[PDB]
Structures are given as structure tokens and as C-alpha cells.
């Protein structure tokens, strides 16, 4: 079928070669209420990632009674916990900002939230994790039906005109843009949306809604520690939180 | 605030205590084109899960030229590969079935597909992984924008009236319903949908579409092998596919 010459299109995004593995660990020894999303080019840093999530579990706090009976990541408490973490590390940035909108599509809200998180991460880091970051924020406001009973989402007060819920997600990043450190970015969402739960469960990005959202997050940089030498038992203990 | 007596509602689904961890492994030594979704109560069986996915990567085959340039899991080749896997194991079930619909919502198609996969797994196994199974099938037909460039989804022929694409997902199951074995269920989707790619990218469960879908899958039961004793280096090699 005669070999044609190369028509090199320089804007054609190539298919990813990244391997994605999702772990659902039933009945963990200790409960973890953070959705853990880990970016890693060297799997020897996975344990470190899981241990950072174990640490920031202690930074979750109850919401006010008016909101409901829910847990959310606290930036203030996050700072406290950061100091106690070993090996020692630094809080590069932190945010506690409200985001609102009126009668806009859910896609707009996802963007507004993305803007805040992209500010936290920075251009370089943002770009290296844009796919999972976009997906993670998307899954905060949509695809909630399948998530409704998960350990990282908490349903608060539910009126006829409003639904309150929290959503806890953590990003661990180790790649070319990080170098000799692994970044950790826990995010605690406190969301008020102008719809009944039943509608919220099946909200899409096309749907329109008014939002009042509080975003609490920080970026924690911890020097890399390989775990190749250690047995898998330690990783198992890390996942269970018994390490 | 006076302690009221217990109003025990026996149909109130409790919140999950399950810990969910997602691993994105950039630049793996060997490429893996299966979305790996692992259900595990004992993390000592993770390596086994990842090694089963490594094995069934060899069961992916190109689609016909008329469909496009895509890879999909082949049930026939899956059976061949199953025999070569060590430790030895058994193919409990296998399917190669077409599923179609006309002018129905995407939710209906998700159900039709679920029915087939639930048949493969069986009542007990199905129920133990219903959340991730429902989500996985949902993400096959929706939420494709964030997935569009991922390693497990391949875009074929794209006309003005039709989009062709494949979607490769693998479930590893180790829990109370499995006992002393781990089940492995690779699934190769070959999907023709009556819409342009741009529309397909932002398809929701509310959208209506005609579908022609081929589903190829099998259930592989391999006796459990704990990896607690082995170092994490082996797991790292398993993820890279160099083990
Ligand atoms: Ca990346
Ligand atoms: Ca389960």
C-alpha cells in the first residue's frame, strides 16, 4: 500500500505509556479517609507516598454542626502535623480560600477549583500531573453516585434547596519536575451546592448550579527515601497504617 | 441535647472503610495497556495481582483494519496465555458476546455490559466488587475526555456518524468470597458508537446513543502466593514488568 512520506503534525498529542494501577484495600487495620492519587516514575518511592497519606490523615477535622457530620482536611492542622513528620520537610505553600459561582455550569466550577490548586502546585508541577488533577477535581463535583459511600466523601446537612458534603483527596508527586524530593498535596473540600442530593449524585459537567466551596490545602516537600531494600511486609504495614 | 433511643434503620448503607490508592507509573520499562483495578483485603497479594496483569498484556491483539489501529484483549489468545502462566491455574469462565442498542441512554448500555460481566463473575464475586465494577463500566462509555490519551484506550476509525474505540480493563479480586485463590478478569471492549469523537468525549449517562459492542473476557483463578518475605524491589520490577 505504497509507503507515503512523513506528514509530521507537531500538535498531535501522543498516547501515554503510563501504567495506571488502582488499589482498593478492604478492611484496613487503620481507616484512611483520603483518596490517594500517586504520581511516581520510580516505584521505589510508593511506600514514602503511602506514609505521607498516613501522616495527613491526622490533619482531618470534623466540620461545624451547622454544616453536618463530616471530616475535611484542615490546612491549619495540616501545618501542625507537617512539623511532626519524619523525615523532616518543608511546607512550600498553603491555601484556605472560598470559591463561589451563581447559575454556572459545573465545568466552570471545576476550572475555578483547578485554578486554586494549580496556584498551589505551580506551572511545572501542575503540567506534570494535569490529567489526574483535572480528573480528581472532576470527580469531586461529578461521578458522585459510584463514590457516594466511599471513605473520602462525607454527606452533611441535606435540605430541599441545598446539599452539603466534604471530599478529601491527596496527591503524591515524584517525577522529573520534583527531582530529589516528593511533593505531597492534601486537599480538603467543603462544598455547598444548590441542589438535592439525588440530583447531585447524577450531576454532570453540563449541569448548572450555584456553589459555595471552601478549599484547604498545602504542599509538603519531603526528601526522597527509596524502599527497595525493605521487604513488602513494610509496604503492607504502611497501607494498613500499622508501620 | 438529650440522648434519644436508637432508631435502627436496617436499610441504611454504611460508609465504606476501604482505602483506595491510585498509582500512575510514568515511563514504565515495559508498556502495559490494561487499566488495572485491584480488590485486595490482604496487601501481601498485590504483587500477584500485578503479575497477572503483566501476563494478560500478552493477550492484547490488534483490531481489524476496518475498525482501526487499536489493541483489545482477546478471549481466544487469553486462553492460550492462561496455560503458560505460573503458578498454574484454571479458566473458570470466558465470554465473547456482542451487545447492541438503538436510541437508548448510555446508562442502559452500562447495565447491558454489567449484566455480561456479572454473568462472568457470578453473584457472590459480583457483589464483593460492585462499586468498582459499576464505576469501571461507567468510565468505559463516559468520562472519556480525561482518559482520551491513556494507554488502555485506543481510538479507531472516526467518521461523521460513528466513532470506533477499544477499552482494556483488568480486575484482580482477593477477598472473603475468593478464599485461597485470586481471581483475574481481563476485559477487552470493542465499541462502535453513533456519534462524533468530540461528542463521545463528553458523553454522560443521560445522553442517548446507538451502540454496537463486542465484549471479550475470561475469569482466571490462581492459588494465592504471599509476597511479604520478598523485597519491594521485586514489586517495583513487577510494575515495570522486568520481574
Ligand atoms: Ca505525569
Ligand atoms: Ca469489596
Swiss-Prot record, chains A, B:
UniProt signal peptide: none
Any single GO BP term: sporulation resulting in formation of a cellular spore
Purpose of the protein: Kills the larvae of dipteran insects by making pores in the epithelial cell membrane of the insect midgut. Acts on mosquitos and black flies.
Domain of life: Bacteria
Post-translational modification: Active after proteolytic processing.
A GO cellular component annotation in the UniProt record: extracellular region
Keyword Transmembrane assigned: no
Keywords attached to this entry: Plasmid, Sporulation, Toxin, Virulence
Organism for this UniProt entry: Bacillus thuringiensis subsp. israelensis
Family label: Belongs to the cyt1/cyt2 endotoxin family.
Entry protein name: Type-1Aa cytolytic delta-endotoxin
GO MF, one annotated term: toxin activity
Amino acid at each position: 500500500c505504497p509507503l507515503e512520506d512523513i506528514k509530521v503534525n507537531p500538535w498531535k498529542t501522543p498516547q501515554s505509556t503510563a501504567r495506571v494501577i488502582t488499589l482498593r484495600v478492604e478492611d484496613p487495620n487503620e481507616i484512611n479517609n483520603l483518596l490517594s492519587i500517586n504520581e511516581i516514575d520510580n516505584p521505589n518511592y510508593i511506600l514514602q507516598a503511602i506514609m505521607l497519606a498516613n501522616a495527613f490523615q491526622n490533619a482531618l477535622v470534623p466540620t461545624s454542626t451547622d454544616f453536618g457530620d463530616a471530616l475535611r482536611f484542615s490546612m491549619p492542622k495540616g501545618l501542625e502535623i507537617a512539623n511532626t513528620i519524619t523525615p523532616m520537610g518543608a511546607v512550600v505553600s498553603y491555601v484556605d480560600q472560598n470559591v463561589t459561582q451563581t447559575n454556572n455550569q459545573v465545568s466552570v466550577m471545576i476550572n475555578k477549583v483547578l485554578e486554586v490548586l494549580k496556584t498551589v502546585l505551580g506551572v511545572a508541577l501542575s503540567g506534570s500531573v494535569i490529567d489526574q488533577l483535572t480528573a480528581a477535581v472532576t470527580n469531586t463535583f461529578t461521578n458522585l453516585n459510584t463514590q457516594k459511600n466511599e471513605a473520602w466523601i462525607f454527606w452533611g446537612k441535606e435540605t430541599a434547596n441545598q446539599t452539603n458534603y466534604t471530599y478529601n483527596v491527596l496527591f503524591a508527586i515524584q517525577n522529573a519536575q520534583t527531582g530529589g524530593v516528593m511533593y505531597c498535596v492534601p486537599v480538603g473540600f467543603e462544598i455547598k451546592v444548590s441542589a438535592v442530593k439525588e440530583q447531585v449524585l447524577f450531576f454532570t459537567i453540563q449541569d448548572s448550579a450555584s456553589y459555595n466551596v471552601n478549599i484547604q490545602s498545602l504542599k509538603f516537600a519531603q526528601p526522597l527515601v527509596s524502599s527497595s531494600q525493605y521487604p513488602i511486609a513494610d509496604l503492607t504495614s504502611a497501607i494498613n497504617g500499622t508501620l
